[PDB]
Amino acid sequence: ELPEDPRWELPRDRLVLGKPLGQVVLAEAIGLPNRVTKVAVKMLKSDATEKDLSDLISEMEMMKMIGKHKNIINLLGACTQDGPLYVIVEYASKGNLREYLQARRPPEEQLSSKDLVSCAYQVARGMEYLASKKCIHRDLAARNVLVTEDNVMKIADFGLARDIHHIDYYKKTTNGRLPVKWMAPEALFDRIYTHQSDVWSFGVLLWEIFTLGGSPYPGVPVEELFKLLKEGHRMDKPSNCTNELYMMMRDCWHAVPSQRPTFKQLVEDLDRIVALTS
């Protein structure tokens, strides 16, 4: 039923399926001839519907068009014939950025100020490329940024299929958080997603980096959040964060979308700051 694509197809016998990472499983690919590469494999569950298959195929086709970049999860290959569709993607051995940051908080080794600003820069870089490829993430957060064994930040879930007119606002993440806390007011209230709302989300992501896994608006429910946003509320400056970096966050949270900086700008700024960061 699935169309063959010689550009990305890998024989099934080349993919040794391993431990589930979260369905996404860790695996080893032989070749990609006599070397094995640890990869992540995305697949469907038994109780899945043809819709679920549709979405999975959509995410793969999306990854194909977007192309490669050091700071995004890249497509490595796929097993589409004679069996369950397997979408082989890059493996991130250190999990998501939130956890990575939390697991290094002082009472695993602590991160330096330069390390933190460097984390931000790489994320801005992944986004700059995605934006240039005409892609709107719609859910940029530290939970959706993965860290490789080499500490390379990689943006994930950028090719995901989603119905904005079907988003349950009263739904928590696996860790029990409310995704609406990363959405720009225009995206949340007017359902208007742009590279600019992604910038708003980047400001929230920056805040998580400088709070080392901090939760945005603890104890604040959907209804109260709407009110904060309507009143033009902005979170406080994280301790151990320069005024310069807080200003960046504040700039990303500009009420007017057109006045927010672009990822191209952010990349220039962060590139300059990193070098000035001890």
Return binding residues for ATP. 21-22, 42, 90-92, 96, 143, 157
Compute the least distance from the CB of residue 132 to ligand SU2, in Å.
21
Give the DSSP H/E element, type plus range, for residue 208: helix 195-209
Binding residue (CB under 6 A) for ligand SU2 from 54, 93, 112, 132? 93
User: Per-residue x/- mask for ligand SU2, residues 189 to 228, rule CB under 6 A?
Assistant: ----------------------------------------
Q: Toward ligand SU2, which CB reaches closer, 130 or 252?
A: 130
Compute the least distance from the CB of residue 253 to ligand SU2, in Å.
28
As for the chain, the residues directly before each break of C–N over 2.5 Å are 22, 32, 107
Binding residue (CB under 6 A) for ligand SU2 from 12, 14, 69, 94? 94
Binding residue (CB under 6 A) for ligand SU2 from 29, 41, 72, 92? 92
Binding residue (CB under 6 A) for ligand SU2 from 30, 58, 95, 214? 95
Q: How far is CA 193 from the centre of its chain?
A: 16
Binding residue (CB under 6 A) for ligand SU2 from 89, 142, 266, 274? 89
Instruction: Find the binding residues for ligand SU2 in span 2-41 (CB under 6 A).
Output: 21-22, 24, 40
In contact, 25 and 18? CB cutoff 8 Å: yes
Question: Does 73 help bind ligand SU2 (rule: CB under 6 A)?
Answer: yes
**Phi, psi (deg, nearest 5) at residue 177:** -110, 165
Contacts of 183 (CB under 8 A, 6+ apart): 197, 200, 201
Gyration radius (Cα) of the chain, Å: 19
Binding residue (CB under 6 A) for ligand SU2 from 146, 183, 249, 273? 146
Q: Toward ligand SU2, which CB reaches closer, 28 or 271?
A: 28
Q: Toward ligand SU2, which CB reaches closer, 139 or 269?
A: 139
Question: Does 116 help bind ligand SU2 (rule: CB under 6 A)?
Answer: no
Residue by residue, DSSP assigns 51-73 as: HHHHHHHHHHHHHHHH---TTBP
Q: Toward ligand SU2, which CB reaches closer, 53 or 192?
A: 53
Active site residue 139: yes
96-127 as b/e: b if 16+ CB within 10 A: bbbbbbeeeeeeeeebeeeebbbbbbbbbbbb
- What span, in angstroms and rounded, lies between the C-alpha atoms of 217 and 223? 12
Say how many Å lie between the first and final Cα of the chain, rounded. 56
- What span, in angstroms and rounded, lies between the C-alpha atoms of 92 and 95? 6
Residue by residue, DSSP assigns 110-175 as: PPPHHHHHHHHHHHHHHHHHHHHTT---S--SGGGEEE-TT--EEE--TT----GGG--SS---TT
Binding residue (CB under 6 A) for ligand SU2 from 10, 140, 156, 205? 156
Q: Toward ligand SU2, which CB reaches closer, 136 or 152?
A: 152
Among 52, 139, 236, 269, the active-site one is 139
| Residues labelled as active-site residues | 139
- Which residues of this chain interact with ligand SU2, rule CB under 6 A? 21-22, 24, 40, 73, 89-95, 146, 156
